[PDB]
Design an enzyme around this catalytic site. Structure first.
Site, PDB file in Angstrom:
ATOM      1  N   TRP A   7     -33.240  75.170   8.446  1.00  0.00           N
ATOM      2  CA  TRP A   7     -33.101  74.577   9.537  1.00  0.00           C
ATOM      3  C   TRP A   7     -31.912  73.883   9.888  1.00  0.00           C
ATOM      4  CZ3 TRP A   7     -37.353  70.634  11.184  1.00  0.00           C
ATOM      5  CH2 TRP A   7     -37.386  70.637  12.511  1.00  0.00           C
ATOM      6  N   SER A  13     -44.151  75.213  -0.261  1.00  0.00           N
ATOM      7  CA  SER A  13     -43.096  76.029   0.123  1.00  0.00           C
ATOM      8  C   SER A  13     -42.254  76.747  -0.837  1.00  0.00           C
ATOM      9  CB  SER A  13     -42.214  75.155   1.071  1.00  0.00           C
ATOM     10  OG  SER A  13     -41.249  76.063   1.787  1.00  0.00           O
ATOM     11  N   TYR A  62     -38.265  66.035   7.297  1.00  0.00           N
ATOM     12  CA  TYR A  62     -38.720  67.274   7.974  1.00  0.00           C
ATOM     13  C   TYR A  62     -39.877  67.085   8.881  1.00  0.00           C
ATOM     14  CZ  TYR A  62     -40.720  72.164   8.460  1.00  0.00           C
ATOM     15  OH  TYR A  62     -41.064  73.321   8.740  1.00  0.00           O
ATOM     16  N   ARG A 118     -41.560  81.245   6.498  1.00  0.00           N
ATOM     17  CA  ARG A 118     -43.154  81.231   6.084  1.00  0.00           C
ATOM     18  C   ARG A 118     -44.001  81.050   6.931  1.00  0.00           C
ATOM     19  NH1 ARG A 118     -47.407  79.074   3.240  1.00  0.00           N
ATOM     20  NH2 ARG A 118     -46.593  77.126   3.609  1.00  0.00           N
ATOM     21  N   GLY A 121     -36.106  71.906   4.212  1.00  0.00           N
ATOM     22  CA  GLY A 121     -35.574  72.182   5.630  1.00  0.00           C
ATOM     23  C   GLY A 121     -34.236  72.512   5.617  1.00  0.00           C
ATOM     24  N   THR A 122     -33.688  73.145   4.444  1.00  0.00           N
ATOM     25  CA  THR A 122     -32.472  73.358   4.253  1.00  0.00           C
ATOM     26  C   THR A 122     -31.640  74.440   5.110  1.00  0.00           C
ATOM     27  OG1 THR A 122     -32.574  73.202   1.846  1.00  0.00           O
ATOM     28  CG2 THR A 122     -30.547  73.764   2.766  1.00  0.00           C
ATOM     29  N   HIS A 139     -27.722  71.578  -3.230  1.00  0.00           N
ATOM     30  CA  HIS A 139     -28.961  70.905  -3.791  1.00  0.00           C
ATOM     31  C   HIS A 139     -28.792  69.835  -4.983  1.00  0.00           C
ATOM     32  CE1 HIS A 139     -31.282  73.514  -1.178  1.00  0.00           C
ATOM     33  NE2 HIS A 139     -30.994  74.680  -1.859  1.00  0.00           N
TER      34      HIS A 139
HETATM   35  C1  LIG Z   1     -31.194  78.872  -3.698  1.00  0.00           C
HETATM   36  C2  LIG Z   1     -31.367  77.965  -4.481  1.00  0.00           C
HETATM   37  C3  LIG Z   1     -32.211  76.986  -4.654  1.00  0.00           C
HETATM   38  C4  LIG Z   1     -33.635  77.635  -4.400  1.00  0.00           C
HETATM   39  N1  LIG Z   1     -34.290  77.763  -3.345  1.00  0.00           N
HETATM   40  O1  LIG Z   1     -34.160  77.621  -1.914  1.00  0.00           O
HETATM   41  S1  LIG Z   1     -33.348  76.836  -1.105  1.00  0.00           S
HETATM   42  O2  LIG Z   1     -33.870  75.839  -0.343  1.00  0.00           O
HETATM   43  O3  LIG Z   1     -32.968  77.969  -0.036  1.00  0.00           O
HETATM   44  O4  LIG Z   1     -32.086  76.861  -1.701  1.00  0.00           O
HETATM   45  S2  LIG Z   1     -34.163  78.136  -6.036  1.00  0.00           S
HETATM   46  C5  LIG Z   1     -34.011  80.046  -6.015  1.00  0.00           C
HETATM   47  O5  LIG Z   1     -35.308  80.843  -6.681  1.00  0.00           O
HETATM   48  C6  LIG Z   1     -35.138  81.455  -7.895  1.00  0.00           C
HETATM   49  C7  LIG Z   1     -36.174  80.802  -9.010  1.00  0.00           C
HETATM   50  O6  LIG Z   1     -36.873  81.435  -9.936  1.00  0.00           O
HETATM   51  C8  LIG Z   1     -33.678  81.317  -8.818  1.00  0.00           C
HETATM   52  O7  LIG Z   1     -33.760  82.391  -9.803  1.00  0.00           O
HETATM   53  C9  LIG Z   1     -32.778  81.759  -7.498  1.00  0.00           C
HETATM   54  O8  LIG Z   1     -31.349  82.060  -8.267  1.00  0.00           O
HETATM   55  C10 LIG Z   1     -32.828  80.546  -6.732  1.00  0.00           C
HETATM   56  O9  LIG Z   1     -31.682  80.600  -5.784  1.00  0.00           O
END
Ligand SMILES: C=CC/C(=N\OS(=O)(=O)O)S[C@@H]1O[C@H](CO)[C@@H](O)[C@H](O)[C@H]1O
Ligand SMILES: Nc1ncnc2c1ncn2[C@@H]1O[C@H](COP(=O)(O)OP(=O)(O)O)[C@@H](OP(=O)(O)O)[C@H]1O
Length: 322
Positions: free
Chosen positions: A73, A160, A218, A288, A70-71, A130
């Site tokens: 949002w 997700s 969420y 999504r 839910g980030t 995170h």
């Molecule tokens: C953005 C950081 C956290 C990630 N995901 O989603 S988030 O909830 O918007 O943050 S993980 C994401 O997916 C990839 C996983 O392989 C990474 O290499 C990439 O740099 C990374 O940003």
């Protein structure tokens, strides 16, 4: 001249080079263990930089989440709440740019893209991360700044993430298959994982200091957003007034930041990229389906049982279910 991160990157890389590595969800992208959690290598560089350099202030507001809970949002909601006196809802900046542009990550934007306008504005109070609770930079902890934490039912969280990873622009290879990815996720081998450990540490922090942390879920917000959006506004120090309530302001905040509104904006359609700094995902990757229960299109009953069991055992008697 080079950024503070750039000046320290080579030592950060040297540092993490001998941390334990495990196979990750991509052939060329191992996971790295720091502080009891597993990390993508760039994001660990990011975390270490933030630990060393990020300076939180008491008036800051920190959005905390494990990825895919839910980030996006919440970033929209917090921005919309905090700035609603500036903008008619036809002229809100959230209609032109992805919510991630308005809430910078302390372990992504702060290290890697420190030149973004929002990070040069001391008037900005909104940050996100995170980073697991135990590993938050010491300034965050000492500042006393308020935090909101959001989590999500784990089957839906995994799905997700696993779908999202198929949209990453990367040279580090195709994502692991569903079965292997899921085995990894269950074993806590995921970016910023183990997921259930991530949630539990934030929950214990919340129990110890309920004035300082707001815990959202969420599914709970999704079924009944208005009360939680009022609660969040109030917790951030921008509570809705009786007049705003009567005028439908809360409904307007919720509609602006809804999945359906944001998904259908031109800014977030197709391959379109964010415009503040380089991205490895199209903006659309963040929207999504936006439902509760989509796991049952992907996981078998046996899969579902395994993770359901793990969560039951970990959280029984903590209050997170009860
Ligand atoms: C953005 C950081 C956290 C990630 N995901 O989603 S988030 O909830 O918007 O943050 S993980 C994401 O997916 C990839 C996983 O392989 C990474 O290499 C990439 O740099 C990374 O940003
Ligand atoms: N405004 C929103 N309201 C509700 N859910 C959203 C919103 N924006 C994005 N999402 C969903 O939230 C999830 C993304 O989470 P992150 O933002 O933490 O990354 C996605 O869920 P899904 O894969 O099950 O669909 C995404 O669709």
């Amino acid at each position: 001249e080079s950024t503070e991160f750039e000046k320290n990157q080579k030592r950060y890389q040297d540092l993490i080079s001998t941390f334990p590595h495990e196979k990750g969800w991509r052939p060329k992208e191992p996971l790295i263990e720091y502080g009891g959690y597993w990390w993508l290598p760039s994001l660990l560089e990011g975390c270490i930089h933030a630990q060393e350099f990020f300076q939180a202030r008491p008036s800051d507001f920190l959005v905390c989440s494990y990825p895919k809970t839910g980030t996006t949002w919440l970033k929209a909601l917090t921005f919309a709440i905090a700035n609603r006196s500036r903008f008619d809802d036809s002229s809100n900046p959230l209609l032109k740019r992805n919510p991630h542009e308005f809430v910078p990550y302390i372990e992504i934007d702060f290290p890697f893209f420190p030149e973004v306008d929002v990070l040069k504005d001391k008037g900005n109070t909104l940050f996100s991360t995170h980073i697991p609770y135990e590993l938050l930079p010491d300034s965050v902890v000492k500042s006393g700044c308020k935090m909101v934490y959001i989590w999500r039912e784990p089957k839906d969280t995994f799905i997700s993430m696993w779908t999202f990873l198929h949209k990453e622009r990367t040279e580090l290879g195709p994502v692991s298959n569903l079965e292997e990815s899921f085995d990894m996720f269950c074993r806590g081998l995921s970016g910023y994982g183990p997921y259930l450990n991530h949630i539990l540490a934030y929950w214990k922090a919340y129990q110890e200091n309920p004035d300082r942390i707001l815990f959202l879920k969420y599914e709970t917000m999704r079924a009944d957003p208005l009360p939680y959006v009022k609660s969040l506004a109030e917790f951030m120090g921008h509570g809705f007034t009786a007049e705003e309530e009567e005028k439908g302001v809360v409904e307007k905040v919720v509609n602006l930041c809804s999945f359906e509104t944001l998904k259908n904006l031109e800014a977030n359609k197709g391959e379109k990229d964010r415009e503040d700094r380089p991205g490895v995902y199209a903006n659309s990757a963040y929207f999504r389906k936006g439902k509760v229960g989509d796991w049952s299109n992907y996981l078998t009953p046996e899969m579902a049982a395994r993770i359901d069991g793990l969560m039951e055992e970990k959280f029984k008697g903590t209050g997170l279910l009860e």
